[PDB]
Amino acid sequence: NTPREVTLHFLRTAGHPLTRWALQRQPPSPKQLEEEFLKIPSNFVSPEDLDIPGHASKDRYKTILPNPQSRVCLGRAQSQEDGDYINANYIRGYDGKEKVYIATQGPMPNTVSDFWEMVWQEEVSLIVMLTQLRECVHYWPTEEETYGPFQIRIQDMKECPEYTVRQLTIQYQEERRDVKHILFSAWPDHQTPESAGPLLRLVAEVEESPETAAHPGPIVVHCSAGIGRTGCFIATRIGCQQLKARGEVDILGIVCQLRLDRGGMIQTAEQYQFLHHTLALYAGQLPE
């Protein structure tokens, strides 16, 4: 068995189910969580695994690449652009449900049009942006701007204590669609949010979003590299979904499935511990 077969086998089979009680009252120790986290393979892809010439100019980081198996490919239905490349992966949701999310990096100035093409092509109606104040381009308009063939307009902007909700529209030719955009700041790279409460309110904000499509598109979740904060946010939502539906959560299993979808999701052991903390808090909100 090669290193890749070893990696795939661990990720497909590792798990550590935690009842609601154990999570709240007897969680794994900080030492055990550190060692568990260290054992999770990254599933990073080597540049030799992508044959996409020119892709490097569209990557924020040379080592953080989209796994080819779940890579979002741009079909260019609406444009004349060369190739199909965006650093973005489809991510499975609760119970392995396909294409619940797209994890991607924040657009670079040269990939803003690619980003909007992706939002059109995938029928995205919700974007979750994770950032901190001192940081990440402003790829949405102040009033109205055109990006490639798309006209984007801001219909509303509402500040909540912990995030800003923008209501946008994107139009191509005759067709105009709503996109809800949530900007959650106060989340530094390689760190955790200040506390779990604002993160759980972000997760609730997402749940409450209007879902009027027959086949809902993926939710776009992004941050600088598209893996640490994105992975934490997606893992928290799936964790909450498991706790609510089954009264238990397998956080190890969750992170392992996310790494199958995009290498490196959840960057630090501190972030991993914070996921336990967050889910313990959510557990107490759940009905008896």
UniProtKB/Swiss-Prot annotation:
Annotated positions of the Phosphoserine modification: S29, S46, S79
Principal location: cytoplasm
Modification type Cysteine sulfenic acid (-SOH): residues: C223
GO MF annotation terms: non-membrane spanning protein tyrosine phosphatase activity; protein tyrosine phosphatase activity
Active site feature: C223 (phosphocysteine intermediate)
Activity regulation, per record: Inhibited in cells after FCER1A triggering.
Residues annotated with Phosphothreonine modification: T2
GO biological process annotation, one example: MAPK cascade
Domain Tyrosine-protein phosphatase as annotated: residue spans: 33-282
Entry protein name: Tyrosine-protein phosphatase non-receptor type 7
Lineage of source species: Eukaryota, Metazoa, Chordata, Craniata, Vertebrata
